[PDB]
Amino acid sequence: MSVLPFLRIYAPLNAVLAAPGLLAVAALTIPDMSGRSRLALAALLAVIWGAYLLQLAATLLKRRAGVVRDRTPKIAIDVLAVLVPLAAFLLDGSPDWSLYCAVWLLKPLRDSTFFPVLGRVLANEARNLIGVTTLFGVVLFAVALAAYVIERDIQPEKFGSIPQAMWWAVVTLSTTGYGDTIPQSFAGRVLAGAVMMSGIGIFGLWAGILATGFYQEVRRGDFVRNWQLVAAVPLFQKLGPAVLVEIVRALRARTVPAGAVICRIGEPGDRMFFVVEGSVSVATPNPVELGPGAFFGEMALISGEPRSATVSAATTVSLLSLHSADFQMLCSSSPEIAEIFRKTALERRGAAASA
């Protein structure tokens, strides 16, 4: 609610072409298909093959930025990105070779930031998951057995064995309800009463384990990435020690590209930003182009009014952002700082029109 993300977060075309490449697959999977388009997209494999293969050697030139790097992941696929279809092309002489389109599926995961963010937390908290995972296996067979107790007599064909019910156990426990084979007696139907009661309570925790400290990491992601852009601000030598921890939880940094808009004039003033790198277009008679290490919105927030200037993204700006309350927090947190933001709320009135 407080951030302006722009400039192609879904940028790399390597990330893009995994999708069309795999939709090329299915037409080969279908009988009664004319051969025209059958091979027409087989080329497109050779394209994306050739395309990453074109990208590939440029990556194998890893003399770029070669000081200290960890590119075992980013290379791990690019090797097999082209070799696996190639050997598949020959030995699997039949068309089944294209079933080695199970290969590009990591290419999205290649430059998938937020996936290392995933695996980071599991190696602290999966301690829980295991004991739950065991406990899941406990309750699975602890409960799955109770059905073999009963309908083995008149449902041999369905419940004549154990795993046939362990099947129906999880399908019954895992919120699903397929509906191929269901009991007929009373007491067997009694038993389900605690099952959905369980599996929703079980995963009531177990799935909850995930968002539990995942949120902490992501709530932490906006600090670890943003204890940067702190000393850059020339004013923040005087901020109190514990002041920052109170603030940066809500501060997110994102980038805007050149030419875009940042805040339009006359819209209801709801937030203020800190510039730390780049430049803007403060739409005024004399444009007050504030570059790295600036801010704006106190003109709108102290008074609680619409906007005073159509600030637009003149260049690619590494932006911060901030809603009122946490600036009201700052105004509340320090009379020393509102002194200057009082002056700023007067300087930028005349200084907006003047040079």
Q: CA 80 to CA 73: how far, in whole Å?
A: 12
Annotate 29-57 with b (16+ C-beta within 10 A) or e (fewer).
Answer: eeeeeeeeeeeebeebbebbbeebbebbe
Instruction: Please choose which of K ion, a second copy, none residue 245 contacts, taking the beta carbon within 5 to 8 angstroms, the exact cut-off set by kind.
Output: a second copy
Which residues in the 96-115 window bind K ion by CB under 5 A?
none
Contact 3, 321 (CB under 8 A): yes
Q: Is 44 in the site for a second copy (CB under 8 A)?
A: no
Which residues are documented as binding site for 3',5'-cyclic AMP? 297-298, 307-308, 348
Residue number with CB closer to K ion (173 or 272) = 173
* Closest separation in Å from C-beta 35 to a second copy: 18
Which of 102-110, 170-178, 210-218, 264-272 is the region at the interface with K ion (rule: CB under 5 A)? 170-178
Contact 304, 272 (CB under 8 A): no
Q: Which of 9, 13, 65, 355 binds a second copy (CB under 8 A)?
A: 9
- Pairing mode, strands 317-319 and 271-277: antiparallel
Q: Which is nearer to a second copy, 90 or 242 (CB)?
A: 242
Q: Is 206 in the site for a second copy (CB under 8 A)?
A: yes
* Per CB under 8 A, 224 contacts a second copy: yes
Q: Which of 294, 313, 308, 311 is nearest to 349 (CA)?
A: 308
What Cα–Cα distance (Å) separates residue 128 from each residue in 26, 118, 200, 208, 218? 40, 16, 17, 11, 20
**DSSP secondary structure string, 218-238?**
HHHHHHHTTSSSSTTSTTTTS
Residue selected from 35, 177, 193, 208 as contacting K ion according to rule CB under 5 A: 177
Residues 280 to 339 in contact with a second copy, rule: CB under 8 A:
304, 306, 323-325, 328-329, 331-333, 335
Rounded to an integer, what distance in angstroms lies between the CA atom of residue 217 and that of residue 351?
A: 42
Q: Which is closer to a second copy, CB of 223 or CB of 279?
A: 223
Q: Which of 66, 193, 234, 350 binds a second copy (CB under 8 A)?
A: 193
Give contact residues for K ion (rule: CB under 5 A): 176-177, 179
